[PDB]
């Protein structure tokens, strides 16, 4: 079960609140995963995190 | 024979042991463990917990300037005297400040990478590694004074550094405090409140020395704190106990004539060895104590000729003590003390093996010497197989844990870790937590494979030889 | 705890003011396995799953 | 027959093991622990975390003389908390008090050291280290009394000590404290005011003695704290639990009759010893046991004298338990039991090691014997080169590694970390910061070449000698 992080810091603080709000992580899940990609164009090398 | 030359290498020894005595002065330690405790781990604040060894970002780089650094440069005036104006700071009440601080610092040119086409939308600003091709000459924000304009090397008397990631000119924008802490704190609150150290700033320099009047031994203080182009902070630090101003007693008096001495010996042993060298044995390389006379010879020269070119060089001194409100650049004496003293331990040290010509006096002795010259031979070439499989195993570690261990990030890390290991000295588990699989199985086969083959290899190649050469003895010596 | 950790070093992470190349917003997936876990019964905390 | 022999060494054995056990006695670990742990490890206020083993001021050294000294030399026994109807473990030093503590202070005079005439503008006051020569004898302060008055050794029945940096003398500028807390605070807190410790002051040591009142042992209490020249505190203790009152119960009686069989064997001893070595074999040190035995008879000796000297100067203690206003003089005693300490220890251990004569009966330990004695001059040869080699690169890493790692400051420090380099005891992560090159290469040089050629070389001699004693000892069997 998929969930963006919004896309300016200004919906994604309502996103949470949403995901707290409505019990999202009640006591039947296992996992979060939260996951994103970075990149450095100095060193020209991308990072999955 | 066997006399004439044991009693004048005898006779080099002790002048030896005599020059290093004083070389390495005692209650020197101390004063560094003094120094480096008050800078390195004072907390940069009474709620912080960090210091200069663990600075992880550059907002902890202004909590520290404007902090634990201003309180151990600028001590309080001891208030006992009519204090005229602006009164200089001891930092242990023993510790002279000598002139005054001066910071600086490295940066790039925003134009400087090229980012790709594809996304060239949402990445704007750019700034590629440190590097002299890739540096920024011209004035940033309010360019009012020297802090923020380019002053190229030779105006500022520097020298490259050789820092952890690159090795940094000694250019830069730099800014020279003040002799009060009420007046350094404001130009380095100035400093902070319109932006100096932006995202494309590389490295930035604090230095400063002291002098100890008590005992005469100048100190020479440099803090570097490195930004690497992927983000992140690097300290590094040095603190060299260096002396300017030896002929004050008798003691000195005394080392310099036993330096005279010292050179003397040189010469008469360079004499000696070129004498030998012109007329007789005009190979002369085939005994393996002649290479380590000519070794000792070069290096002795070498240190010689290093002592007279950083004690001729010390203009520096006095031109400080003319004006005494201006910087004082001790680094390059630094840099030469440093490498005076290491060239002065390798040839101490290979003084000491030169010493083992003269222990072969009974008959005990002379069996030990014939073995380890019998089986050098053999130990070498089997060195060479234990250092080509040690190497093939130090670069597998590198290719495979070499980002993410922390211990295999550069190969002669790898090659001190792998060292480290015979030791006993590992903790088995970055290895795991890096890698489940090809973890655990690269430390069981070379702790096995190391360890017993080629440890048991050099065992017997040296038992054999032993063997047989003390046989061949005996058997001479029941036959005879 | 996962929210106040994302509140405070992730959101001002992952947006920023200048800073952090992102190439890709983030994302939450999880998994839900749709049963009710049972709390671990008190005794020599087991360190299994 | 050599069983009669046998007969009397397991005696004399027996009887000195019997001794030491009785005189090793048993909990004195526990009251010096509680000792440390009080007078070390509470902090100076409340406000604070520094105790006195980490005092890196002069004012945190004021403090602790107000502040954990005295709140815990005072009947610090009070049974505040929840203690069980009765004083509790930790709570069993109720430690009345004989007499008066005493303080004193050692410092230098100014101009002690010259300072060069280009900082003479800058620089007014020069105080050299701590020595003889240098040492202030002058009035200072408000000269009124023994604390601002100097005092030479003799009036003053002092020592010299041995501290941490030098070895300070027994004069100095003392106070004897006085009995209640009200007035010993309200002493220190004038000595305090008036300065005290100015910049010239090199060393101040607080002495002062217990007896517990229960389990009948006394305890001799020392503390130094030492300001080097360099600015700093260095502190130091010395905690010795004494028991000269041995005759309270019927057990102690019996060790009375064992010194006595301890003096007739040793007279016994001396006296064999005497009428061999005229008559028979006359220089007869050739062998081992023979040059073992007087070492032995040599320590028992010195051992009964030293405690021959104790027991006269027991009545020097006694003489004064209900009178509290005088300091009592108790360094002697506690050094001299230590050294009494170190002696039995030495002459056990010797004691222990001559048993190996007796055990040559069978043939597997003369076998073992006989190889273990006939590879004695090997093996010593050997070490010659292999501590030839050992001090080479202590003193290489004493030159390189002397001022900033704090494992290889002094000689003596160099031997004993590489020691523990040869069991993997190494840190490594200031090895390689302290010196990037010349470090690892120090490090890697000697592992290899240590372990591998140096314990292969060590093994191989045993190993050789001993399939060659096996040889013979086989082939001188079966053949006559
Ligand atoms: C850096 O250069 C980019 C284009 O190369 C430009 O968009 C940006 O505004 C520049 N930044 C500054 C601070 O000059
Ligand atoms: C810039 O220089 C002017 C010179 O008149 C000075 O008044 C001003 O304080 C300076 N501003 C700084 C250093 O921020
Ligand atoms: C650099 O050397 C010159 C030449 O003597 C000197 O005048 C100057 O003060 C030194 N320092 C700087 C920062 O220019
Ligand atoms: C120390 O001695 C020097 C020698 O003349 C003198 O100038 C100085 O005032 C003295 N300082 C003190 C504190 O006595
Ligand atoms: C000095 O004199 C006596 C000690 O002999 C003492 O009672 C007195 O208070 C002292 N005077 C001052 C000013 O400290
Ligand atoms: C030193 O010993 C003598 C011996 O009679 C004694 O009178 C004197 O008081 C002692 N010194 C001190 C400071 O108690
Ligand atoms: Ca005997």
Same mark, same amino acid.
């Not at chain 2, 930092?91 to 005054?100: A, K, T």
């Not at chain 2, 350094?184 to 932006?195: C, F, M, P, Y």
């Given at each position: 079960?998929?969930?963006?992080?919004?896309?300016?810091?200004?919906?994604?603080?309502?996103?949470?609140?949403?995901?707290?709000?409505?019990?999202?992580?009640?006591?039947?899940?296992?996992?979060?995963?939260?996951?994103?990609?970075?990149?450095?164009?100095?060193?020209?090398?991308?990072?999955?995190? | 024979?066997?006399?004439?030359?044991?009693?004048?290498?005898?006779?080099?020894?002790?002048?030896?042991?005599?020059?290093?005595?004083?070389?390495?002065?005692?209650?020197?330690?101390?004063?560094?463990?003094?120094?480096?405790?008050?800078?390195?781990?004072?907390?940069?604040?009474?709620?912080?917990?960090?210091?200069?060894?663990?600075?992880?970002?550059?907002?902890?780089?202004?909590?520290?300037?404007?902090?634990?650094?201003?309180?151990?440069?600028?001590?309080?005036?001891?208030?006992?005297?009519?204090?005229?104006?602006?009164?200089?700071?001891?930092?242990?009440?023993?510790?002279?400040?000598?002139?005054?601080?001066?910071?600086?610092?490295?940066?790039?040119?925003?134009?400087?990478?090229?980012?790709?086409?594809?996304?060239?939308?949402?990445?704007?600003?750019?700034?590629?590694?440190?590097?002299?091709?890739?540096?920024?000459?011209?004035?940033?924000?309010?360019?009012?004074?020297?802090?923020?304009?380019?002053?190229?090397?030779?105006?500022?008397?520097?020298?490259?550094?050789?820092?952890?990631?690159?090795?940094?000119?000694?250019?830069?924008?730099?800014?020279?405090?003040?002799?009060?802490?009420?007046?350094?704190?404001?130009?380095?609150?100035?400093?902070?409140?319109?932006?100096?150290?932006?995202?494309?700033?590389?490295?930035?320099?604090?230095?400063?020395?002291?002098?100890?009047?008590?005992?005469?031994?100048?100190?020479?203080?440099?803090?570097?704190?490195?930004?690497?182009?992927?983000?992140?902070?690097?300290?590094?630090?040095?603190?060299?106990?260096?002396?300017?101003?030896?002929?004050?007693?008798?003691?000195?008096?005394?080392?310099?004539?036993?330096?005279?001495?010292?050179?003397?010996?040189?010469?008469?042993?360079?004499?000696?060895?070129?004498?030998?060298?012109?007329?007789?044995?005009?190979?002369?390389?085939?005994?393996?104590?002649?290479?380590?006379?000519?070794?000792?010879?070069?290096?002795?020269?070498?240190?010689?000729?290093?002592?007279?070119?950083?004690?001729?060089?010390?203009?520096?001194?006095?031109?400080?003590?003319?004006?005494?409100?201006?910087?004082?650049?001790?680094?390059?004496?630094?840099?030469?003390?440093?490498?005076?003293?290491?060239?002065?331990?390798?040839?101490?040290?290979?003084?000491?093996?030169?010493?083992?010509?003269?222990?072969?006096?009974?008959?005990?002795?002379?069996?030990?010497?014939?073995?380890?010259?019998?089986?050098?031979?053999?130990?070498?070439?089997?060195?060479?197989?234990?250092?080509?499989?040690?190497?093939?195993?130090?670069?597998?570690?590198?290719?495979?844990?070499?980002?993410?261990?922390?211990?295999?990030?550069?190969?002669?890390?790898?090659?001190?870790?792998?060292?480290?290991?015979?030791?006993?000295?590992?903790?088995?588990?970055?290895?795991?937590?890096?890698?489940?699989?090809?973890?655990?199985?690269?430390?069981?086969?070379?702790?096995?494979?190391?360890?017993?083959?080629?440890?048991?290899?050099?065992?017997?190649?040296?038992?054999?030889?032993?063997?047989?050469?003390?046989?061949?003895?005996?058997?001479?010596?029941?036959?005879? | =705890? &996962?929210? !106040?950790?994302?509140?405070?070093?992730?959101?001002?992470?992952?947006?920023?003011?200048?800073?952090? #190349? =992102? &190439?890709? !917003?983030?994302?939450?997936?999880?998994?839900?396995?749709?049963?009710?876990?049972?709390?671990?019964? #008190?005794?020599?905390?087991?360190?299994?799953?």
């Amino acid at each position: 079960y998929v969930q963006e992080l919004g896309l300016s810091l200004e919906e994604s603080r309502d996103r949470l609140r949403f995901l707290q709000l409505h019990n999202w992580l009640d006591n039947r899940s296992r996992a979060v995963f939260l996951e994103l990609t970075r990149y450095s164009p100095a060193v020209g090398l991308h990072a999955a995190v | 024979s066997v006399l004439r030359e044991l009693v004048t290498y005898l006779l080099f020894l002790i002048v030896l042991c005599i020059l290093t005595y004083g070389m390495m002065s005692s209650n020197v330690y101390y004063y560094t463990r003094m120094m480096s405790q008050l800078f390195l781990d004072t907390p940069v604040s009474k709620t912080e917990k960090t210091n200069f060894k663990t600075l992880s970002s550059m907002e902890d780089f202004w909590k520290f300037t404007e902090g634990s650094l201003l309180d151990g440069l600028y001590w309080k005036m001891q208030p006992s005297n009519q204090t005229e104006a602006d009164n200089r700071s001891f930092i242990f009440y023993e510790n002279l400040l000598l002139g005054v601080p001066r910071i600086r610092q490295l940066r790039v040119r925003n134009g400087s990478c090229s980012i790709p086409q594809d996304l060239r939308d949402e990445i704007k600003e750019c700034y590629d590694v440190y590097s002299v091709s890739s540096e920024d000459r011209a004035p940033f924000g309010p360019r009012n004074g020297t802090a923020w304009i380019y002053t190229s090397e030779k105006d500022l008397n520097g020298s490259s550094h050789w820092g952890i990631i690159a090795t940094y000119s000694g250019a830069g924008y730099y800014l020279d405090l003040s002799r009060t802490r009420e007046e350094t704190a404001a130009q380095v609150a100035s400093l902070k409140k319109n932006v100096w150290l932006d995202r494309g700033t590389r490295a930035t320099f604090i230095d400063f020395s002291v002098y100890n009047a008590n005992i005469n031994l100048f100190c020479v203080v440099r803090l570097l704190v490195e930004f690497p182009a992927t983000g992140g902070v690097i300290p590094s630090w040095q603190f060299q106990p260096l002396k300017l101003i030896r002929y004050v007693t008798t003691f000195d008096f005394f080392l310099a004539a036993c330096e005279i001495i010292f050179c003397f010996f040189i010469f008469y042993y360079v004499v000696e060895e070129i004498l030998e060298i012109r007329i007789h044995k005009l190979h002369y390389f085939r005994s393996f104590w002649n290479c380590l006379d000519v070794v000792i010879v070069v290096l002795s020269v070498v240190a010689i000729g290093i002592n007279i070119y950083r004690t001729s060089n010390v203009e520096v001194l006095l031109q400080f003590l003319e004006d005494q409100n201006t910087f004082p650049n001790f680094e390059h004496l630094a840099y030469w003390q440093i490498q005076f003293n290491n060239i002065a331990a390798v040839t101490v040290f290979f003084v000491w093996i030169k010493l083992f010509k003269f222990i072969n006096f009974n008959r005990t002795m002379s069996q030990l010497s014939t073995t380890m010259s019998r089986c050098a031979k053999d130990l070498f070439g089997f060195a060479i197989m234990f250092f080509i499989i040690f190497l093939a195993y130090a670069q597998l570690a590198y290719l495979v844990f070499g980002t993410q261990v922390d211990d295999f990030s550069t190969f002669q890390e790898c090659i001190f870790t792998q060292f480290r290991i015979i030791l006993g000295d590992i903790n088995f588990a970055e290895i795991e937590e890096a890698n489940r699989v090809l973890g655990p199985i690269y430390f069981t086969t070379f702790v096995f494979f190391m360890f017993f083959i080629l440890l048991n290899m050099f065992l017997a190649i040296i038992n054999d030889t032993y063997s047989e050469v003390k046989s061949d003895l005996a058997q001479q010596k029941a036959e005879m | =705890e &996962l929210w !106040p950790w994302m509140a405070h070093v992730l959101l001002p992470y992952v947006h920023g003011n200048q800073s952090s #190349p =992102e &190439l890709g !917003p983030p994302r939450l997936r999880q998994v839900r396995l749709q049963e009710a876990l049972y709390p671990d019964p #008190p005794g020599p905390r087991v360190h299994t799953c």
